[PDB]
Design a binder for these strands. Structure first.
Ligand SMILES: [Zn+2]
Ligand SMILES: [Zn+2]
Lengths: 120, 147, 183, 645, 65
DNA sequence: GATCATATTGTCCAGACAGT
DNA sequence: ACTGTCTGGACTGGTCGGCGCTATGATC
RNA sequence: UCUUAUUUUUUUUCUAUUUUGCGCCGACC
């Protein structure tokens, strides 16, 4: 349990976490010792910059588009979808097999060409 | 003949019983019978016409504390004077505690029990590897009945 | 799974940090206190971003330090059961392969890495398929979902993560591309 | 079972009174362990010369121990003075103790050679003038806690030890020289596998256990961690108490790890025949194993009182000494050459019926620390051999250029002012590294101190206490010359963490010999953590590294190893010091060494059993020996019985 | 020493058994029973279990090992 | 001689209670 | 409803200094 | 001149860093 109580909880994406870790790295560089963070945070930043598929503002726009498109999905589902960036039915199926809902091919397709917009 | 209980020091009930027997032999006491089972510790049974004879016979012995006021029914001590091996009533799969032997003060689980050789086979629960050992049937005590 | 939380907490500022700004001192204390640990209901506490609001301090008896009620932003990572994640294999040993997916290192069993008795090559730390003839090497991007998280300790390294990979649609990126080509 | 010990003792007494002069006054003749003890009233006429004692020992085939009868006994406060006057002052006697229950005097002295005698006549003269049977032990120049504890245990438990020895002597000589109907070898462990070795020699009269050990590698699985206790033969032997003796080839966890487990649950009550160095090193290793098992959080295998009981049930046998350990089985121990006190076990069954030679871990090339393995036996029929390096491609590099590379790496490290950290085992390669460093520093190559940390000092002290078990060169240096290689001033030992911190913070060059090759525990981890960021330092690995350990991780070239530091936060070790791997100091026999031992053994064994190694390596070694020499070779699995005769 | 007979379960100090006339003696025994009266109930219980025991006053036992 | 299980079961004030 | 009776609890704090005690009757 | 049984591959190191209690007596504030 972090703190006395939790006010807001959000499922943040990889790109925004990478931006936050870069800000922390800049703060540590401003800090006099040459080591900005510990092993776990530095390794997390390295993994995020290795898997930096989307820009933070593009990831935010995609997440808000997913949130406003449907109603049964949550922040976690949108974050996972923008992390994976699915292209066909296989990855969507292996993502949603253990989930509460096995989406139909039509909504899977609409998620697919919502995802592939401005996709690198 | 009524059965009464005489409390004695633990571990020397047989010596006190022998002393009472010698006193009865050499003092003309109206004592009918004396019993001292090995399983019962610290007490002996005396079959006598009345408790007064019991307290008179045990009087003068510093190792005999007192005589219990009640009278023991014969059905309670009937099973004591019965020919029955100590390994009887022990079934494999339960847990026992070894009273004596090289494994003194150890809990184990019964694997094989036979009454012809008056011995029992137990596996130590504290042993990481299961190695059965043999121990006399009267050296164990049942702690929990299970199959 | 990465998470952003807004947490209100009492922060203890020692008298040596009195000359500094209260927000900066609270941020420093929270960074030295909560960062680098594991929480049962929150996960890997990765970073403290900033402190939004702070309150007037209260001095408790027996301590000269000042306690402030402060709200701050925390970036954490929480592994979820049956959650898919992409990572990179960073360590390979015979009983299982270690992949980096974030602050933690997930473990993938050699038995359950594939539906094939894959042999471990000790010469170059490689995984070789007997029938599929697919080679797994270091630095290969993989995707797998988690099935077991050990939260028995508050230390990140002592926590154990086990994933599942034998299901179709998982494995190396080239394997996923080849599977998509068939479909 | 029936016992004819009384008749044998009566006939032995009759032979003695026929041969020994009547005026000697023979009162009692008894059996103590594998030896025959005779109590006399007039020792002056008993041992006027050693020829009579030698003839009695040859005729009776017993280790004759002539002691004065307890009826007459000089007072200890006067016996000490007569012993000090009689023993030359050159032999520094450190302790004198007296056992009056059975007349004995234990003399713990720095120079046992002068106390014992030129041909043993000094002991006879002492026990003639003072009427106290003497037993001389060596005072170690480096004090050892384990040896002192063992001596104190043996002294304070003289009654129990004497009763156990008497019962062992009664059990051994329950019958005369017996020809066994059949001889069988069974492997309860260590067959087609490494670790948890256990051998069973079975006859129709006696059963003998050999090097009962434990498997450290497979400790998570109880099935593979311990020797098979479900073997019907082992169950029968342990159940009916028919185990005559236990013999330990050498002091190691795979050969003596499970020994106190039998005494923990009172599964064994007989003797354990082993060399004194093997005994002390085995107790030290067992104590260490129990300590790390108790630290790791798992339940310890046995209590230290079980190790004490093992000490109380241990009989010391020197090299080349033949003792009767079973009515049909004689036991002797030869120099294996693997570690200190490592013994090749030669079991002679029957009167020429069969001979088994269990080598165990051994080395055939002449090393600096120990003499080469004994390849000559009076008779040999079955040879049980290790196969740790039995593979075709298993070729260890020679020792000369390996030690040259180690010396030059150390010299280059000390030239730039760095520190040398050498993780090593508790025994074996560590003392070899110490000897190589001492030889290098004796000519003036290096004057830097050498720090021994983490129980290596205890092993060094045990090595000093038994110099006769070392190599010929070290024996020549210690005995004939006045220079002890282990007593060099460069070798230093720490006292606490303060001295270790002072060594780490010291800017002068130094050599540190650690305690754990894997850097799993001991001061090795602390030294690695505090010396890794310095690039001038270096680390030398003299042993194999196991996967998943810190040693293998730092050997594989990892420049940043994340470990669990204090406060539950991951701290990285930035390894900038040089990493070296010189694995040429292994004490195990090479494949070429095994082939040379097979070719040069005398006499040629009828059959060879390849054990103590991986299954493929054992099969390869057996096939190679069969194809090269034609000897029948077998590599059986566990729970396999081979009928030798 | 102290020994108990195996047939009549009598406890005697010397080698001879003066009650049953048998030549089997056991050094290990428990459950000492003292008989002073013929008609006493525990003597009758001994008689029905061991037909050759509790015939004369003295010492007896139920089981001998 | 050296060990070993057992070793017994002054006054005053206030609250609760049978008795009449 | 009264009245004498049985039972239970507490009896100022602190300090200096000393004296003395904390096994034994069977068993091999 | 006849019934009712089955059958096969994925977990690692030879070991380690300042005597209480009980009770008595006396004295002082
Ligand atoms: Zn070995
Ligand atoms: Zn009889």
């Amino acid at each position: 349990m972090i703190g006395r109580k939790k006010l807001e909880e959000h499922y943040i994406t990889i790109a925004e976490a990478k931006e936050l870790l870069e800000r922390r790295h800049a703060e540590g560089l401003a800090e006099n010792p040459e080591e900005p963070m510990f092993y776990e945070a530095r390794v997390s930043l390295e993994h995020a910059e290795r898997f930096a598929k989307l820009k933070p503002e593009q990831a935010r726009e995609l997440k808000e588009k997913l949130m406003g498109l449907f109603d049964w999905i949550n922040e976690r589902i949108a974050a996972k979808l923008v992390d994976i960036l699915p292209e066909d039915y296989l990855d969507i199926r292996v993502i949603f097999a253990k989930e509460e809902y096995m989406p139909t091919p039509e909504e899977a397709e609409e998620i697919i060409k919502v995802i592939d917009e401005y996709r690198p | 003949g009524k059965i009464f209980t005489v409390s004695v020091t633990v571990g020397q009930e047989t010596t006190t019983a022998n002393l009472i027997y010698s006193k009865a032999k050499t003092y003309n006491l109206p004592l009918y019978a004396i019993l001292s089972p090995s399983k019962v510790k610290g007490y002996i049974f005396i079959e006598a016409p009345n408790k007064s004879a019991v307290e008179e016979a045990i009087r003068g012995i510093r190792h005999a504390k007192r005589v219990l006021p009640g009278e023991i029914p014969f059905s309670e001590i009937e099973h004591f004077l019965e020919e029955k091996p100590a390994v009887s009533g022990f079934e494999p799969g339960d847990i026992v505690e070894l009273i004596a032997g090289p494994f003194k003060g150890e809990k184990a689980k019964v694997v094989r029990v036979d009454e012809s050789k008056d011995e029992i086979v137990v596996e130590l629960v504290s042993s990481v590897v299961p190695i059965p050992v043999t121990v006399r049937g009267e050296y164990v005590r049942l702690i929990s009945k299970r199959q | 799974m990465y998470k952003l939380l807004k947490v209100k907490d009492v922060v203890r500022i020692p008298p040596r940090m009195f000359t500094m700004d209260p927000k900066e001192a609270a941020k420093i204390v929270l960074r030295e206190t909560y960062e680098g640990i594991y929480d049962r209901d929150e996960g890997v506490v990765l970073a403290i971003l900033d402190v939004e609001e702070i309150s007037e301090g209260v001095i408790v008896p027996g301590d000269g330090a000042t306690y402030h009620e402060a709200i701050f932003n925390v970036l954490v990572w929480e592994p979820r059961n049956q959650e898919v994640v992409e990572g990179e294999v960073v360590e390979m040993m015979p009983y299982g392969a270690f992949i980096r997916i974030g602050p933690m290192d997930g473990l993938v069993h050699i038995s359950q890495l594939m539906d094939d008795y894959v042999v471990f090559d000790e010469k170059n730390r490689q995984f070789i398929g007997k029938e599929t003839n697919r080679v797994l090497k270091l630095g290969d991007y993989v995707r797998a979902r988690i099935i077991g998280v050990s939260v028995k300790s508050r230390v990140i390294r002592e926590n154990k993560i086990n994933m599942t990979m034998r299901q179709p649609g998982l494995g190396k990126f080239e394997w996923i591309e080849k599977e998509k080509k068939k479909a | 079972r029936e016992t004819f010990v009384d008749d044998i003792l009566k006939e032995i007494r009759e032979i003695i009174v026929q041969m020994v002069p009547r005026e000697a006054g023979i009162t009692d003749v008894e059996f103590e362990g594998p030896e025959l003890v005779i109590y006399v009233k007039n020792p002056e006429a008993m041992m006027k010369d050693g020829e009579l004692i030698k003839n009695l020992a040859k005729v009776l085939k017993k280790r004759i121990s002539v002691r004065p009868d307890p009826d007459i006994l000089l007072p200890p406060e006067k016996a000490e003075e007569l012993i000090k006057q009689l023993v030359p002052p050159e032999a520094e006697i450190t302790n004198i103790s007296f056992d009056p229950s059975v007349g004995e005097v234990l003399i713990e002295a720095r120079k046992p050679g002068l106390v014992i005698g030129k041909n043993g006549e000094t002991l006879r003269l002492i026990t003639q003038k003072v009427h106290w049977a003497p037993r001389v032990v060596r005072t170690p120049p480096i004090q050892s806690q384990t040896i002192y504890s063992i001596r104190s245990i043996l002294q304070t438990e003289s009654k129990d030890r004497r009763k156990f020895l008497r019962q062992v002597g009664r059990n051994i000589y329950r019958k005369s020289e017996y020809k066994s109907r059949w001889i069988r070898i069974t492997g309860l462990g260590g067959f087609r596998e490494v670790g948890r070795s256990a051998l069973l020699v079975q006859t129709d009269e006696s059963y003998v256990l050999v090097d009962f050990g434990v498997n450290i590698a497979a400790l998570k699985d109880p099935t593979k961690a311990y020797p098979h206790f479900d073997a019907p033969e082992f169950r029968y032997v342990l159940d009916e108490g028919l185990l005559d003796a236990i013999i330990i080839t050498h002091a190691a966890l795979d050969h003596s790890g499970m020994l106190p487990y039998l005494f923990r649950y009172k599964l064994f009550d007989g003797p354990i025949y082993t060399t004194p160095p093997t005994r002390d090193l085995m107790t030290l290793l067992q104590q260490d194993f129990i300590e790390i098992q108790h630290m790791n959080g798992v339940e310890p295998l046995y209590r230290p009182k079980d190790i004490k009981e093992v000490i109380k049930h241990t009989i010391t046998l020197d090299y080349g000494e033949v003792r009767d350990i079973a009515p049909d089985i004689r036991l002797t121990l030869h120099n294996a050459g693997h570690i200190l006190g490592s013994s090749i076990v030669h079991l002679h069954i029957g009167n020429g019926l069969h001979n088994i030679a269990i080598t165990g871990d051994f080395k055939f090339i002449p090393t600096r620390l120990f003499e080469p393995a004994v390849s000559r036996f009076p008779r040999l029929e079955t040879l049980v051999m290790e196969s740790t390096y039995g593979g075709s491609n298993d070729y260890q590099m020679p020792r000369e250029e390996a030690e040259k590379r180690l010396i030059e790496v150390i010299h280059q490290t000390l030239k730039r002012g760095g520190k040398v950290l050498i993780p090593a085992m508790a025994v074996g390669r560590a003392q070899e590294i110490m000897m190589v460093l001492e030889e290098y520093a004796r000519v003036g190559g290096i004057e830097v101190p050498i720090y021994l940390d983490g129980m290596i000092w205890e092993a060094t002290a045990i090595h000093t206490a038994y110099p006769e078990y070392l190599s010929k060169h070290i024996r020549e240096q210690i005995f004939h010359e006045g220079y002890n290689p282990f007593l060099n001033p460069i070798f230093k030992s720490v006292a606490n963490s303060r001295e270790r911190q002072d060594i780490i913070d010291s800017g002068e060059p130094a050599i540190i010999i650690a305690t754990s090759g894997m850097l799993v525990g001991g001061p090795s981890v602390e030294y690695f953590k505090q010396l890794a960021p310095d690039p001038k330092n270096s680390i030398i690995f003299v042993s194999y590294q196991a996967e998943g350990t810190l040693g293998r991780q730092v050997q594989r070239g990892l420049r940043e190893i994340p470990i669990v530091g204090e406060d539950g936060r991951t701290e990285v070790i930035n390894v900038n010091m040089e990493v070296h791997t010189i694995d040429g100091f292994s004490g195990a026999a090479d494949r070429r060494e095994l082939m040379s031992y097979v070719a040069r053994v005398r006499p040629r064994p009828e059959r060879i059993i390849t054990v103590h190694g991986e299954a493929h390596k054992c099969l390869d070694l057996s096939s190679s020996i069969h194809k090269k020499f034609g000897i029948s070779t077998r590599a059986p699995n566990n729970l396999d019985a081979i009928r030798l005769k | 020493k102290e020994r108990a007979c195996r047939h009549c379960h009598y406890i005697t100090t010397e080698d001879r058994c003066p009650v049953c006339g048998s030549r089997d003696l056991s050094d290990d025994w428990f459950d000492l029973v003292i008989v002073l009266d013929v008609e006493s109930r525990i003597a009758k219980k001994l008689r029905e279990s061991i037909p050759e025991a509790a015939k004369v006053p003295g010492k007896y036992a139920i089981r001998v090992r």
